[PDB]
Amino acid sequence: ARQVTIIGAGLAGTLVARLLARNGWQVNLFERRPDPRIETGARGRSINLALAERGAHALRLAGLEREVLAEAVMMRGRMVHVPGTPPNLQPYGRDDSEVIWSINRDRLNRILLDGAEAAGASIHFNLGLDSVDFARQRLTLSNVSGERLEKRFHLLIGADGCNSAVRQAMASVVDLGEHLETQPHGYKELQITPEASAQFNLEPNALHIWPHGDYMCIALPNLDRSFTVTLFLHHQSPAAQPASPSFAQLVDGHAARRFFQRQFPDLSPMLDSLEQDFEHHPTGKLATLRLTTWHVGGQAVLLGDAAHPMVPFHGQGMNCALEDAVALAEHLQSAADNASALAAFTAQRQPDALAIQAMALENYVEMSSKVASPTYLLERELGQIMAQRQPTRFIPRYSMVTFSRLPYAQAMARGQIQEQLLKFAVANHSDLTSINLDAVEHEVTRCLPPL
């Protein structure tokens, strides 16, 4: 049996461990954190994630989708909150076929861990990768208290997240051609209790957004009617606009409270533990990192956040990571040798990773705008007309990304064609009055092949 060592029992690492192990591979998976399935007296994390068709399908192939969805809340649409103005649900699709699932990150992780072990993978916790000797095919791990352990490896999979140690190690033997693009927003996780969300009649089967331009909040529901809220806000005010809100200004929980009372007055009443959450939950960092190479010969490869850190504004990092896991296991299973598999995997996934990284950056503007411009309303309306006329040709980009398995790069290409098509048709027309719809439709049939 072929042997593989995987670093990182997160989302991609644990899925790929299952897929390889059930195909007969001898799999050893190493994880820095303790086993989350071993219950302790400690809290438990309420981090939420949006699971979309890509990620769901990857779990489906692994035989885990039913188990995961049993513990997921359906989000049928977006609830946009603007002060006053009673929240209006914007449905994703026309029935519950087109939905996004809200799932607890650590619940998902436990299910994946069970899945990997059921398939035959051996999982080793409390062991973080420190370094790799590629020439001698050995690596060094250590626990939190630093005592070290060495292991031989044959094939190394870096599924160890956005600060990948495998990636760091590879940079010693190949030029990764890395370029880091920092992002000015930080994030803070906050909580709405089940009592609070019921009291304010917050819809459980929706994704909620409080847009506010340069900053915003989003909330995803949990099975117990609590919500996990994320604030996205600049780390610092520009020297340009020093007065503008930023984490630097929010010097403590009381400052955070005044900020929410002023800028999010309808959300603040729902955040009972705002002060405490704010001070005890560290501010997170966001970034996009792009790599020229993802592998070292047939010896090591990167997967998921290790390969392509992205900003979280499209809710697709997990989805992309699980999709990566399927692709990597597919290539490894059937290739002539590991070097061939890793090159083919990289060639396949790299253009799709670049596309979703770009689309995720673009999606911030869509989400954070408090109201839509007059002409963008007109384009969206013409687009829905075209979608009705040619539903296999005109598919809104968000829907291609979120509710289909179309490769990200094609979703982006078709999305580009569609937006341009809408702009020329919309120009100099105040409403759908002037716009000859059937002229636009064979413009659609011209440049958008049916799918």
Ligand X SMILES: Cc1cc2nc3c(=O)[nH]c(=O)nc-3n(C[C@H](O)[C@H](O)[C@H](O)COP(=O)(O)OP(=O)(O)OC[C@H]3O[C@@H](n4cnc5c(N)ncnc54)[C@H](O)[C@@H]3O)c2cc1C
Residues that bind ligand X (CB under 6 A): 7-13, 30-33, 49-50, 128-129, 159-161, 165, 187, 230, 284, 304-306, 312, 315-319, 321
Laid out side by side, the sheet with 284-290 consists of: 88-91, 77-80, 207-212, 215-221, 227-234, 179-192, 284-290
The annotation status of 419 as a binding-site residue, yes or no, is: no
Least distance CB 296 / ligand X (angstroms): 17
Q: How far is the CB of 284 from ligand X (least distance, A)?
A: 6
- Does 349 count as an annotated binding residue? no
**Is 290 annotated as belonging to a binding site?**
no
Residue found by looking up tokens 């979280």 in the block: 312
Gap between the terminal Cα atoms of the chain: 40
- Residue 11, annotated ligand binder? yes
Residue nearest to ligand X (CB): 10
Residue among 37, 18, 50 nearest 107 (CA): 37
C-beta closer to ligand X: residue 203 or 443: 203
Could you tell me how many helices (H) and strands (E) the chain has, helices first?
Answer: 14, 19
Is the Cβ of residue 80 or residue 435 nearer to ligand X in the bound state? 80
Is 412 annotated in a binding site? The answer is no
Q: According to the annotation, is 109 in a ligand binding site?
A: no
318 is in an annotated binding site: yes
Residue 389 assigned to a binding site = no
- Is 203 one of the annotated binding-site residues? no
d(CA 153, CA 173): 16
Question: Is 243 labelled as part of a ligand binding site?
Answer: no
| CB nearer ligand X, residue 173 or residue 387 | 173
We find the least distance from the C-beta atom of residue 197 to ligand X, in angstroms, to be: 19
Closest to 222 (Cα-Cα) out of 200, 194, 201, 202: 194
b/e sequence 189-210, b meaning 16+ C-beta within 10 Å: bbbbbeebbeeeebebebbbbb
Beta-sheet pairing, 48-51 with 284-290: unpaired
Q: Which is nearer to ligand X, 312 or 383 (CB)?
A: 312
Enclosing H/E stretch for 119:
none
Q: Which H or E element spans position 102?
A: strand 100-104
Report in angstroms how near the CB of residue 109 gets to ligand X at its nearest: 7
Question: In this complex, which beta carbon is closest to ligand X, that of residue 108 or of residue 270?
Answer: 108
Percent composition of the chain: helix, strand, coil (DSSP 3-state, to 5): 40, 20, 40
- As measured in angstroms, the least distance from the Cβ of 115 to ligand X is 14
CB of 149 to ligand X, least distance (A): 12
Q: Which two tokens stand for residue 155?
A: 């094939």
- Closer CB to ligand X, residue 145 or residue 373? 145
For residue 324, the Cα-to-chain-centroid distance in whole angstroms is: 13
Contact by Cβ (8 Å): 337, 155: no
Among residues 31 and 65, whose Cβ is nearest to ligand X? Answer: 31
CA atoms of 217 and 222, how far apart (whole Å):
16
Q: How far apart are CA 244 and CA 236, in angstroms?
A: 9
- Map tokens 């990997």 to a residue: 116
Sign of CA dihedral 366, 371, 376, 378: positive
Query: Do the annotations mark residue 156 as ligand-binding?
Result: no
Nearer to ligand X, 316 or 363 (CB): 316
Residue 30 or 394: which CB sits closer to ligand X?
Answer: 30
Is residue 92 annotated as involved in ligand binding?
yes
Q: Rounded CA gap, 153 and 3, in Å? A: 8
Task: Write the residues followed by a gap in the chain (C–N more than 2.5 A).
Answer: none
Binding-site residue ranges for L-kynurenine: 78, 92, 363, 398
Annotated binding site for FAD: 11-12, 31-33, 50, 105, 129, 305, 318-319
Annotated binding site: 11-12, 31-33, 50, 78, 92, 105, 129, 305, 318-319, 363, 398
